[PDB]
Each structure stands twice: as structure tokens, then as C-alpha cells.
Design a protein around this ligand. Structure first.
Ligand SMILES: [Zn+2]
Length: 270
């Protein structure tokens, strides 16, 4: 059985579904964990030294990766799950900043799963037929999930499709399924929201009639609650943008994470 380490919980689940009985997957960032503020520990280094495959997001999400690979002595296979995926970027200070959250489009999740399948087959060719069978089944589930998600938003009004959340993690979801996401913090929870941005969000919501706000499982909800209180926005619940729920929760897998987020956002539209 291949020993696989994922950088964070979402990728660990995709690797588990693709690999099935032929992989054992551990994750560095766990359920409800913030991937932006994470730094790895000696326990993480020890775990990676035993691994056959490491699965990461790329797109700048794991700044610590190279130093952890060096310290651990990891000599296995590195799989960048975002390879080939079309990225989005923000235009800031005359430069571009890549948005790493590409998996919140289920069509991109299917591309992630194909990259992970490719890496597992490369690392375990003895099981290539079995891995390809379970992988292609999962990929088909994800492209059909993408079609289901589009359908939940396509037959409802295009006007006023705006929600408020804690940070800018749903950009690819919003582009794929056509919903505008507002948030006081940007692409990363390493950066505090400026007074300028908080004031502008409150003004925008008051002026443009945003009705629903969400918290996120990996990020302190105090700030989004402050904006909601200043605007009278009503709660829509808890979204799971970049970490699975704990076991027994509403977002125990990537599929269930996507379904949960789609259901909650669509229901708030409505
Ligand atoms: Zn994020």
C-alpha cells in the first residue's frame, strides 16, 4: 500500500477516493485547519520522511514545502494537483497575485483528481488498472457534480447573486457557478483586513442589498460577524472553503464539501 501525505485535508480526500484500497493517506493540515497560517512541525517532518508520495496544491499555497522536503529527507514522488488548471489572478500594485483556491470549481476538482491519479499510477504501476478504474469513476463523479452545481444556480435569477463570507476563497466557485462573493479579508488569512476595506464592504452591502452572510470553518468569524451586525445581514450558516469538516460533520469529503457549499449558497438566493 502506497503511503501518501497530502498538504491539506481536501487533497487528502481526493487522493483517498482515487486510490482506494491501494493507498493510505495522512494529511498535514487537518480538518478545520487554516492552510494559510499553517507551519509544519517536527512530527510533520517525521511523517513525510516515511512517505512514498506527497500531494500538494501548488499556486503558492505551501510556502514551507521545499524546506520541509529538505528537512525530512523525503525522496518520493511530488504531485502538484493544480498542474494544467487555468488560474485566476488579482491585479494589485501593478503586479498579479494568483488565487490558489482552484478546487472550489468541481470541474477543476476533476482536473486535480486526474493529476493525482497520474501520480499514483506513476508511483504504483503494479496497481495501474485498479487505480485507473477507481480514478476514472471518481473523475466522472466530479464532472457530473460540476453539472449539478451549475444547474442549482442556472435556473434562478441572475440579479443580486451576492453573499458575504470571511475571506476570498470562493473566487473559482463564483466564476464557475456565477455568484459574487464579498469578504473583508483577501486571498490569505495571513493579512488583516484594512479599515478601508471593512468600511467599503459595509457601504457596499448597505447600498446594494446583500442579505446573507456566512462563516467559514477554518477562520475566526468575529470580523464577518461585525460586518453583518453593522448591515443587518442574516446568517446563512457555515461554509467549508478550504478544509474538510471533522468526522461526523457536514463536509467529510471533497464531494460532501462541494455539495454542502452549493446547497447553503443556493438556499440563500431565495
Ligand atoms: Zn484561503
Amino acid at each position: 500500500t502506497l503511503n501518501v501525505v497530502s498538504s491539506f485535508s481536501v487533497l487528502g480526500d481526493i487522493a483517498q477516493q482515487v486510490g482506494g484500497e491501494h493507498v493510505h493517506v495522512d494529511t498535514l493540515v487537518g480538518p478545520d485547519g487554516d492552510p494559510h497560517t499553517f507551519e509544519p512541525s517536527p512530527k510533520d517532518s517525521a511523517l513525510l520522511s516515511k512517505a512514498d508520495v506527497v500531494v500538494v496544491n501548488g499556486l503558492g499555497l505551501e510556502g514551507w514545502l521545499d524546506r520541509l522536503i529538505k528537512a525530512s529527507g523525503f525522496k518520493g514522488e511530488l504531485v502538484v494537483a493544480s498542474k494544467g488548471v487555468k488560474t485566476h489572478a488579482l491585479d494589485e500594485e501593478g503586479k498579479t497575485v494568483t488565487d490558489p483556491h482552484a478546487w472550489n470549481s468541481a470541474a477543476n476538482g476533476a482536473l486535480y483528481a486526474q493529476n493525482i491519479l497520474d501520480g499514483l499510477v506513476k508511483a504504483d504501476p503494479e496497481d495501474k488498472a485498479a487505480l485507473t478504474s477507481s480514478g476514472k469513476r471518481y473523475i466522472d463523479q466530479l464532472t457530473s457534480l460540476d453539472g449539478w452545481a451549475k444547474a442549482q444556480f442556472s435556473a434562478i435569477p441572475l440579479a443580486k447573486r451576492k453573499v458575504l463570507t470571511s475571506h476570498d476563497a470562493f473566487g473559482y466557485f463564483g466564476r464557475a457557478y456565477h455568484v459574487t462573493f464579498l469578504a473583508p479579508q483577501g486571498l490569505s488569512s495571513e493579512s488583516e483586513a484594512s479599515a478601508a476595506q471593512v468600511a467599503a464592504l459595509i457601504k457596499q452591502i448597505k447600498a446594494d442589498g446583500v442579505h446573507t452572510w456566512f462563516m467559514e470553518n477554518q477562520l475566526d468569524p468575529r470580523l464577518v460577524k461585525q460586518i453583518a451586525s453593522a448591515t443587518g445581514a442574516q446568517p446563512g450558516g457555515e461554509l467549508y472553503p478550504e478544509a474538510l469538516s471533522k468526522p461526523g460533520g457536514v463536509a467529510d469529503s471533497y464531494v460532501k464539501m462541494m455539495r454542502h457549499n452549493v446547497e447553503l449558497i443556493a438556499n440563500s438566493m431565495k
